């Protein structure tokens, strides 16, 4: 029923799924600001990944 589709779409505001995603690989978080040997860890992550 159109009513239940309305109710579903109302409730999606509060608990949505992720339809589209644009992602970066996690090594891009490895940053010298946080970690010694950042480059080395980064490269290791590339290889491991």
């Amino acid at each position: 029923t159109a009513d239940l589709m309305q109710e579903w779409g109302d409730a999606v505001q509060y608990n949505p799924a992720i339809i589209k995603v644009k992602v970066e690989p996690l090594y891009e978080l490895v940053t010298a600001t946080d970690f010694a040997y950042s480059s080395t860890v980064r490269q290791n992550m590339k290889q491991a990944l």
Binding site: D3, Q6, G9, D10, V12
Partner: protein
């Protein structure tokens, strides 16, 4: 005295029929409340408006 009769009948019926019935629709909305969007975009086939 002698008598002969031969009788022959052949009858043929062939019938055929087909239906193709295709229905398509794509209501599209931008803006407004997500529940109103989903409720209205849902295609009431009896009232496509």
């Amino acid at each position: 005295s002698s008598h002969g009769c031969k009788e022959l009948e052949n009858a043929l019926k062939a019938a055929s029929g087909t239906q193709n019935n295709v229905l398509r629709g794509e209501p599209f909305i931008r803006g407004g409340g997500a529940g109103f969007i989903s409720g209205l975009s849902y295609l009431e086939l009896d009232n496509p408006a």
